[PDB]
Design a protein around this ligand. Structure first.
Ligand code: GNL
Ligand code: BR
Ligand code: BR
Length: 559
């Protein structure tokens, strides 16, 4: 029999196959009802052992999954001059995708590998095992077993999960991760809005909702994002347009009704309409296709100026009809609009002209856009600014409400992000930051972006994770394409943990008040928590959440 060693670890370790493992063992934790709780087990052999049999024994087995932590390439792990908090800076193989056990799991000579364990807890009232509804908590063991192909025992670890008998309350943070339907169609080689495409969209949206996405980017017309000037992405257009004469249109909303019904069925709460003017300037219209005498033709795009009377007349016809749709489906308090993403100060006049067209028709509706110039908000050009987390200080200082934030490739220094080359505490700490600063919404551009920069070519996300050496690996997507639907990354699992932390902090505030809650979160910090300053440390984050959980368990409750 070969030598075989194991180590039980938290969800916040990243186990590399080319390095010694310094992380300390973790064999206990706590959670609430409705929480997803995760851990992992690292293992190593001097020998090549193929097709390990890995099993768990627990009363929690109906709620438990086990997956293999796979390795992904990164050619651009970092931009120049990365800060000292980065875990690695070299190109190589990084732990990231989570694969089904049925795909096969191996021990590879003198390499630490990992399996990842997910426990998706129900409500107390749906829980199948016996449980004392009058106890403050109950602990359950989870035993994980490794055998070879022939049934010889190789290793084991025991984890003890304490479940506290309170429910993690429903998320009220607004959270959008931009959803690229085109990337689904080109990966799976299906036509846009075929029945095969709709089935895949549903699977991808269900994953998003399960990970705390409650606001979905909704493609009225092909979203004008990450597209070179004079280029295109695959047509994704929910609105049907018939051109009936020069500057004269008729509209049908049937595909939009299908999309909205899908959102309501799967648990999306807010409809975020796609941008109506081109990125980084608001200079042009999106690609728009229409039918003339049965035949499809492009009527708007990079050859139709945003300020031209042609696009103005089109929107004067379209937008009142979309408002009628919104009122007829009782969506009045459930919608957001976009003008144009990421304008600079040099683009303020064009952004204003575009905003003025929408404001003729969309009075009473929420309008937001990603942009970070406070000087740009002062002049009333944008209703809800969404500043980046490294530029948020002036928005906080001036009491802007509702407060939103985002991050992307530009947020490479100090702040929370989700790059391969950053630690899992640096990802998960966002939750605590959103709590302390009273943030109302979080936006990310990259649920499943699987093209290169400017959408010049299709890439394979299992081979190219940096959009062809443009964006640090991890920025453009959190899910990979499995055979029948999405595969999670460890980064996506850790992001959900941050959201859960925010929900736990808000519960402790309901029970004990904001002053005591903030005092607990900041206990023994050398410096105040900010978006740029925090302990990047596994023990700090785990012990802080354990303290929050203990305070909830011990609090005096009303019925
Ligand atoms: C809201 C955003 N808009 C941009 C996206 O379209 C991408 O280019 C991304 C790259 O990191 O950067 C920003 S994040
Ligand atoms: Br051996
Ligand atoms: Br929340």
């Amino acid at each position: 029999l070969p030598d075989f060693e194991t180590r039980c670890l938290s969800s916040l370790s990243k186990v590399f196959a080319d390095a010694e493992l310094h992380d300390l063992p973790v064999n206990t934790g706590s959670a609430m009802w409705k929480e997803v709780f995760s851990f992992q087990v690292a293992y190593r052999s001097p020998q090549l052992i193929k097709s390990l049999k890995i099993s768990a024994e627990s009363e929690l087995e109906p709620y438990l999954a086990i997956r293999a932590v796979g390795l992904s390439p990164s050619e651009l792990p970092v931009f120049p001059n990365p800060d000292e908090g980065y875990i690695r800076t070299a190109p190589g193989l990084y732990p990231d995708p989570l694969y089904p056990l049925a795909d096969g799991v191996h021990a590879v000579p003198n390499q630490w590998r990992s399996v990842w364990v997910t426990v998706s807890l129900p409500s107390m009232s749906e829980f199948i095992p016996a449980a004392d509804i009058g106890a403050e908590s109950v602990s359950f063991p989870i035993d994980l077993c490794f055998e070879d192909g022939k049934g010889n025992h190789l290793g084991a670890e025991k984890f003890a999960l304490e479940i506290i008998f309170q429910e993690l309350p429903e998320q009220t943070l607004l959270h959008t991760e931009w959803f690229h339907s085109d990337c689904i169609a080109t990966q799976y080689k299906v036509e846009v809005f075929s029945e095969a495409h709709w089935k895949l969209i549903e699977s991808y949206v269900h994953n998003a909702v399960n990970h705390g996405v409650n606001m979905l980017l909704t493609p009225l017309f092909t979203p004008p994002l990450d597209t070179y000037v004079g280029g295109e992405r695959p047509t994704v257009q929910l609105i049907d347009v018939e051109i009936t004469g020069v500057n004269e249109y008729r509209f049908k909303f049937d595909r939009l009704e299908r999309w909205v019904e899908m959102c309501q069925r799967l648990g999306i709460q807010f409809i975020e309409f796609s941008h109506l003017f081109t990125q980084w300037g608001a200079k042009y219209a999106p690609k728009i296709i229409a039918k003339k005498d049965g035949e499809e033709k492009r009527i708007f795009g990079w050859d139709t100026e945003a300020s031209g009377e042609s696009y103005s007349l089109f929107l004067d016809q379209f937008l009142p009809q979309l408002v009628h749709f919104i009122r007829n489906h009782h969506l009045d308090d459930k919608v957001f609009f976009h003008v144009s993403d990421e304008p600079g100060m040099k683009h303020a006049e064009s952004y204003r002209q575009a905003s003025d067209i929408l404001n003729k028709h969309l009075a009473g509706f929420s309008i937001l856009d990603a942009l970070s110039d406070y000087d740009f908000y002062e002049k009333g050009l944008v209703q809800i600014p969404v500043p980046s987390n490294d530029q948020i200080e002036p928005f906080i200082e001036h009491g802007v409400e509702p407060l939103w934030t985002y991050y992307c490739c530009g947020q490479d220094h100090h702040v929370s992000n989700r790059f391969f080359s950053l630690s899992s505490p640096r990802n998960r700490v966002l939750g605590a930051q959103l709590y302390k600063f009273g943030v109302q919404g979080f936006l990310h551009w990259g649920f499943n972006f699987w093209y290169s920069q400017y959408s010049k070519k299709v890439i394979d996300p299992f081979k190219v994770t940096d959009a062809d050496c443009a964006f640090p690996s991890g920025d453009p997507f959190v899910v990979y394409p499995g055979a029948d639907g999405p595969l999670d990354s460890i980064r996506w699992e850790v992001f959900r943990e941050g959201l859960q932390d925010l929900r736990a902090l808000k519960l402790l505030e309901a029970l004990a008040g904001r002053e005591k809650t903030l005092a607990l979160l900041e206990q023994n910090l050398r410096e105040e928590l900010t978006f740029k300053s925090f302990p990047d440390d596994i023990e700090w984050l785990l012990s802080t959440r354990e303290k929050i959980n203990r305070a909830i368990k011990d609090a005096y409750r009303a019925d």
